[PDB]
Amino acid sequence: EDAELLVTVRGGRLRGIRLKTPGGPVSAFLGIPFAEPPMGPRRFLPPEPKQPWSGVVDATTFQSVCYQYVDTLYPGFEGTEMWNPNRELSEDCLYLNVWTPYPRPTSPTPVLVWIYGGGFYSGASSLDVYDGRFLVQAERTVLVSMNYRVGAFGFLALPGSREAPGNVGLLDQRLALQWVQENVAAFGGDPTSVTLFGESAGAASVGMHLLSPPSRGLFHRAVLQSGAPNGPWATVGMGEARRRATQLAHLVGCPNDTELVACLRTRPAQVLVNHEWHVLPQESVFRFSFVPVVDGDFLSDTPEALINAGDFHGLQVLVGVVKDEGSYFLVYGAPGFSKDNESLISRAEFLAGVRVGVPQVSDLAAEAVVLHYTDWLHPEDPARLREALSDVVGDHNVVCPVAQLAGRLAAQGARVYAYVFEHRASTLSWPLWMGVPHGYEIEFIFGIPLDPSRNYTAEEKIFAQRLMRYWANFARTGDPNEPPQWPPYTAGAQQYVSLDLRPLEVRRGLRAQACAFWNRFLPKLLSA
Amino acid sequence: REDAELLVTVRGGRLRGIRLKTPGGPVSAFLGIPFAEPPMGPRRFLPPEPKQPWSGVVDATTFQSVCYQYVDTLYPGFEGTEMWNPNRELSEDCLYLNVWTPYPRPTSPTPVLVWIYGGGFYSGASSLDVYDGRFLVQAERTVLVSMNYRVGAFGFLALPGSREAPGNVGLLDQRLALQWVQENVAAFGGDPTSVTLFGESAGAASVGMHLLSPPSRGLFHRAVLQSGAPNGPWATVGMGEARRRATQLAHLVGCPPGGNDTELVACLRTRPAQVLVNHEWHVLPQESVFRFSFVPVVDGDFLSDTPEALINAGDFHGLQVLVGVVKDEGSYFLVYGAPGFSKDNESLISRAEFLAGVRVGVPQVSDLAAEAVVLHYTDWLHPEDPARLREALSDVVGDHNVVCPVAQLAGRLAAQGARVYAYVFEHRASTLSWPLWMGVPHGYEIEFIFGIPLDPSRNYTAEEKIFAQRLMRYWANFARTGDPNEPPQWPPYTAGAQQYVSLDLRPLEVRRGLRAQACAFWNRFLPKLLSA
Ligand SMILES: *[C@@H]1O[C@H](CO[C@@H]2O[C@@H](C)[C@@H](O)[C@@H](O)[C@@H]2O)[C@@H](O[C@@H]2O[C@H](CO)[C@@H](O)[C@H](O)[C@H]2NC(C)=O)[C@H](O)[C@H]1NC(C)=O
Ligand SMILES: *[C@@H]1O[C@H](CO[C@@H]2O[C@@H](C)[C@@H](O)[C@@H](O)[C@@H]2O)[C@@H](O[C@@H]2O[C@H](CO)[C@@H](O)[C@H](O)[C@H]2NC(C)=O)[C@H](O)[C@H]1NC(C)=O
Ligand SMILES: *[C@@H]1O[C@H](CO[C@@H]2O[C@@H](C)[C@@H](O)[C@@H](O)[C@@H]2O)[C@@H](O[C@@H]2O[C@H](CO)[C@@H](O)[C@H](O)[C@H]2NC(C)=O)[C@H](O)[C@H]1NC(C)=O
Ligand SMILES: *[C@@H]1O[C@H](CO)[C@@H](O)[C@H](O)[C@H]1NC(C)=O
C-alpha cells in the first residue's frame, strides 16, 4: 500500500489513486461521499451530512452523475458530447473530488473549488474538461470539485413548503464547502485560503455564495467565468417557480404541497427529466426550468439588490467572458441557425430570433432591442444579422450581467480583475461563424492542452500554462499578475485584458454601449 | 419719360419697378407689390382677402414693412443675430411680395423660384439682406418671387372652430401669394407652369405643408426644403394646445374682462400689436429651445391630418424634391436656453447641465423618453467629457427638430414615387461671427444659395464666390429640370441606399445615411415609446 493515497476524513478512511501528468504524478481522491444519498423521501430536501463509515471508502474513480437531461441535438458530435454525462445517472450523486500534489503537501496549500455550469439542469464534476490533474501539478494547489443536484432534483420549489423548499442544489454546494473547511487540511489544503471558481451556472453559483452570508464564511476569493448571479436566467421568482413545479406535477400525472411532492417522489427520476423543458412559459434559448429561487432565505433579496447594497471591501474577484458568448445558444432555437450552415439569417428570422432570445418581454421592449442591434445602413445584411443576434443573446445573458456585477462590486470596495477570452482552439469542432463560443476557455484554464493524447499546438500549451498561472496567482494573492500588467477593473475606466496567444492587451469597456441599454435603460422601460 | 422695362400690368393694375445694379449686370425688381388687403383692425386673425384693383400706377420700388413680430435681444448689436431682425418698420400692414426678373425682361417663359423665409413662424421678412434675389436672377436667369406672411399670433393664433380666429392664416397668406404668381408671373416673363418653392426652417416646413394641402399643390411643381420639414415636433400644434395658448395669451392681456370665441377675439383686436408680442413667449407650456408659441394647427382644413400621416399616405409620383441640412443644426439653438451655453465661451457643459439640457431640448416628454434620449446620446466610455457632452446636446436638438424629420420625409417621399435629392451643407463661412464651437450653424447655407458672396461690399474669399456660384447652379438646375446635375454626379436619395452629397469647397462627395442610427431612434422607436 501507498501511504500517500491513504487519508482519514472526519467520516472515515479513504483510498485514493496516483495519476500521471506530463509534469509528474498527482494524488487524486475521487468519489468521496459528502452527503447522505438524497433518495426516496429525501428527494427535493436539503442535503444531510454523510454519516461516518467503517472500513475504507474506494476513492479511485468518479461517482455517478446527478440525474439530468442529455443533449441530443447533434448525436455523436464532440462539441455537444463533451458536456454530456460520462458516468451513469443516479440520484445517489452527492460526491466530491480532491486532487493534490504527489507526495501530498506537508504545508498548507491554497485550495481551488470548482463549481461546474450547465444551466442548473446539467453538468458533472467527472467531465474530461474539468480534470484537475494539470492545474494541481503545474501550480501546486489543492483542487476540489463537487457534484450538486440539478434540474427538478436540485431546484424544484414550492416556496414556503417544507417538502420542496427549493435551492437544495445550492445547499449541496454549501455542504461541500463546509466539508472542505472541515477536511481539506487532511490532504494538505489550507482551509483559510479557499478560492471558488465556476463557469456559467457555476459562476452564477459562485456569485450566490458571495451574496448569502452562511456561505461567505466558507471561502475567501471568487472567480466568475461567463456568468453572474444577476442575469435574467439564473433566478426565478416565487410565483413562477410554484407555477413551474405545479405544471411538472400535472405533466407526470400528479395532483396542497404535501400531497403534490409525495406524488412526485413516487416518479422515476427519468420521468421528471423527460418533461423538464415543457414547463418553460415560451420557446426560448438561454432559459432553464428549475433554477435558484429568490424566497428570502438563501437569497434575502434579488442578486441585483444585494449587489447594490453590499459592502465588498476586502474581496477580490476575477471575472470575464469569451469573445462570442451568444453563438452557441442560437442553434438551440433561433430560426435559421445550425452548426452545419453559415446561418446567414434574414431580417424576418432576425426579428423572430429576438423574441426567442429575449423571451417574456413586451413588444415595446423587443422593439427597443431591434433598434439598438440594427445597423440602419445595412438592416438586412445576413452576416450582420447573424452577428447581431449572437450579440443580443450574449449581451443580455452573460456580458452585461457580468459587467454590472464587476462595476458594482468595484465601486463598492472590491478589487476586480476582468478579461475577455479571445482564442479559438485549434481543436474546436464548432463552425467558424461561432467564433470563440461559450465554455471554450475552460479547457485552457484546466491545462487540458498539456495532455499529449490531444492535438493542441505548442503555442496553445504555453497559453494554457499562462492562464493556469494567472488563475493560481489570483488564488494565492488576489492578484493574477506575475510579479505587461493586468490592471483592476473600475466602474469609470472599465479596464480589462484580452486573453489570447498575444501578450496581454488592456482595453476599456465590456460592451459599454450595449450594456448601458440592458443594465440602465431597459429595467426602467419594464417598470412603465 | 419712363423705362418700359420697369412698367408691368398685373391683374390688379399697373406697377412701376426699379433697375437694380448687380456685379454681373442689370436686374429688374418690383419690390412691395400688394397682394392682399391690409389685415388690420377687424381683419386681424382673419384669412387674407385679395388686393382690390387700383387705378394709376403703384410704385413697387422698395421693400414694404415687416409683419409685426418679436425682435431678438439676446446679443444686441451682434451681427449673428441682427442679420435676422427686421430691417423695415413693423406693421400689421405687411402683405406684400417681391419679383426680380432679368433686364431686359425674358421673351420666353422663364422658370420661377418662390422663396418662403423661416423664423419659427414668429419672425422673418422677405426684405432681409440675406434673401436679396438680385444675384440668383442675374447669375441663373430665373424669375424670383418672395412674399411676406403674417407670423406670431397675427398669423397663427388659433381658436379652432371659430371663424374669427381660425388659425393658419399666415399659411393662407403664402397660398394667396402663390395664387398671385400663377395669375401674374407671366407678365414679368415667368412661367407659371414651372414654379419651384424653396424655403428654410419654418419656410421649409411651410413648403412641405403646401405639398400636403391639395389646394396649394396645384400652384407649384417642385419643392426645396432647407433645414426643415412639416413633420417636425415644432412645426405644428394640436387643436387643444393651440386653443390653450390662444386663451392664455388673451388672459395675459386682459381678454375677457376664455368663454365666447367672438367676444374673445373682439377683445384681442383692441389690443395694440406690441402688447400681444410682449406676452407671446409666456404661453409655452415649459422652458425650451426650438419651440414657438403660434405655429400651424392641425385642424382638418389646411392640414386634413398630421403631416406625418399625410406623408405616409401620399402618392408623390411626378414630384421632384431637393432637401438637406447644415452640418450642425442644433448648435445655434443651445444659447437660447440650454444651461451652460453661450456664444461667448466654449460652453463646455457638465454632465448635470447636459441632463438638464435634454429636458429643455426635448420638452414635454415623459421621464422614460428623456432616459431613452440620454441612453442614446451618452458615450458610456466618456460619460462626463464636457466637449463630447456639448456636441451631444447639439446633436440631440438638431436631430430631434431638423435632421430626422427631414430624413423621414425624404425617405417616405422617395419610397412613394418622388425623385429626391439630399445634401449636407458643411462649409463654415469665412465671415461667420458665431463662435467656432458652433460649427456650421442652422441658417448659414442661405447666403450661399442667394449668392450673397458676389456682393462687392462684403469680404468673402474668391473660393466662396465660386462655391456660391456652384450652389446657385444646382438650385436653378433643379428648378428648370427637377435635377440639380448639369446636363461628379449627385445621385437621388432613396430609402435603401440613402445617398446624399456634401456641399463644401471640395467637389461633391457621395455619402450614405442622414444620421441613420440616430434617426431610427427618433423616427421609429420613440413614437412607439410615447404610446404607452
Ligand atoms: C441552415 O440550416 C437551418 C436548419 O436546418 C436544419 O439543418 C440542415 C441539416 C438542413 O438540411 C435543414 O433541413 C434542417 O432543418 C435552416 O433552417 C431550416 O429550414 C428548414 C427548411 O426551410 C425549416 O424546415 C427549418 O424549420 C429551419 N430551421 C431553423 C432552425 O430555422 C436554414 O435554412 C439553413 N441555412 C441555409 C440553407 O442557408
Ligand atoms: C358668442 O358671442 C357672439 C358675440 O356677438 C354678440 O352679439 C350680441 C348678442 C351682443 O351680445 C354683442 O355684444 C356680442 O358681440 C354671439 O354672436 C352674436 O349673436 C347674436 C345674437 O345671437 C347675433 O346677432 C350674431 O350671431 C352675433 N352678433 C354680433 C356678432 O354682433 C354668439 O351667438 C355667442 N354664442 C353663444 C353660445 O353665446
Ligand atoms: C458660459 O456662459 C454661460 C452663460 O452665461 C454667461 O453669463 C455671463 C455672466 C457671462 O459670464 C457670459 O460669459 C455668459 O453670457 C455661463 O452660465 C452662466 O453662469 C452664471 C453664473 O454662474 C449664471 O448666472 C447663469 O445663469 C449661467 N447661464 C446659463 C445659461 O447657464 C457659463 O458658466 C459659462 N461657462 C464657463 C464660464 O465656463
Ligand atoms: C471688408 O474690408 C474692409 C476693410 O479692409 C471693410 O469694409 C470691412 O472690414 C470688411 N467688410 C465690410 C462688410 O465692410
Swiss-Prot record, chain A:
Single Gene Ontology BP annotation: receptor internalization
Cited InterPro entries: AB_hydrolase_fold (IPR029058), AChE-related_enzymes (IPR050654), AChE_tetra (IPR014788), CarbesteraseB (IPR002018), Carboxylesterase_B_AS (IPR019826), Carboxylesterase_B_CS (IPR019819), Cholinesterase (IPR000997)
Compartments, record wording: Synapse; Secreted; Cell membrane
Domain of life: Eukaryota
Glycosylated residues, chain numbering: N256, N341, N455
Keywords carried by this UniProt record: Blood group antigen, Cell membrane, Disulfide bond, Glycoprotein, GPI-anchor, Hydrolase, Lipoprotein, Membrane, Neurotransmitter degradation, Nucleus, Secreted, Serine esterase, Signal, Synapse
Topological category with respect to the lipid bilayer: Peripheral membrane protein
Active site: S200, E325, H438
A molecular function GO annotation: serine hydrolase activity
Catalytic activities: acetylcholine + H2O = choline + acetate + H(+)
Membrane-crossing segments per the record: none
Result, substituting E325A: Loss of activity
Binding site for huperzine A: W83, Y130, Y328
Tissue specificity as recorded in UniProt: Isoform H is highly expressed in erythrocytes.
EC number: 3.1.1.7
Effect of D395N: Misfolding, absence of secretion
Segments forming a coiled coil: none
Entry GO terms, CC: basement membrane; cell surface; extracellular region; extracellular space; Golgi apparatus; membrane; neuromuscular junction; nucleus
Keyword presence, Signal: yes
Binding site for huprine W: G119, S200, W430, H438
Assembly and oligomerization: Interacts with PRIMA1. The interaction with PRIMA1 is required to anchor it to the basal lamina of cells and organize into tetramers. Isoform H generates GPI-anchored dimers; disulfide linked. Isoform T generates multiple structures, ranging from monomers and dimers to collagen-tailed and hydrophobic-tailed forms, in which catalytic tetramers are associated with anchoring proteins that attach them to the basal lamina or to cell membranes.
Annotated function: Hydrolyzes rapidly the acetylcholine neurotransmitter released into the synaptic cleft allowing to terminate the signal transduction at the neuromuscular junction. Role in neuronal apoptosis.
Family that this chain belongs to: Belongs to the type-B carboxylesterase/lipase family.
Protein's UniProt name: Acetylcholinesterase
UniProt organism field: Homo sapiens
Swiss-Prot record, chain B:
EC number: 3.1.1.7
UniProt-annotated binding residues for huprine W: G120, S201, W434, H442
Catalytic activity field: acetylcholine + H2O = choline + acetate + H(+)
Listed result of changing E329A: Loss of activity
Tissue: Isoform H is highly expressed in erythrocytes.
Domain of life: Eukaryota
Residues engaged in binding galanthamine: W84, E200, S201, Y332
Gene3D superfamilies with a match to the protein in the record: alpha/beta hydrolase
Residues listed as glycosylation sites in the UniProt record: N260, N345, N459
GO biological process: one example: nervous system development
Gene Ontology MF, one: acetylcholine binding
Catalytic residues (positions): S201, E329, H442
Protein location: Synapse; Secreted; Cell membrane
Listed InterPro entries: AB_hydrolase_fold, AChE-related_enzymes, AChE_tetra, CarbesteraseB, Carboxylesterase_B_AS, Carboxylesterase_B_CS, Cholinesterase
Disulfide bonds, paired cysteine numbers: C67-C94, C255-C267, C404-C519
Membrane topology: Peripheral membrane protein
Binding site for huperzine A: W84, Y131, Y332
Biological function: Hydrolyzes rapidly the acetylcholine neurotransmitter released into the synaptic cleft allowing to terminate the signal transduction at the neuromuscular junction. Role in neuronal apoptosis.
Family: Belongs to the type-B carboxylesterase/lipase family.
Subunit annotation: Interacts with PRIMA1. The interaction with PRIMA1 is required to anchor it to the basal lamina of cells and organize into tetramers. Isoform H generates GPI-anchored dimers; disulfide linked. Isoform T generates multiple structures, ranging from monomers and dimers to collagen-tailed and hydrophobic-tailed forms, in which catalytic tetramers are associated with anchoring proteins that attach them to the basal lamina or to cell membranes.
Protein name per the record: Acetylcholinesterase
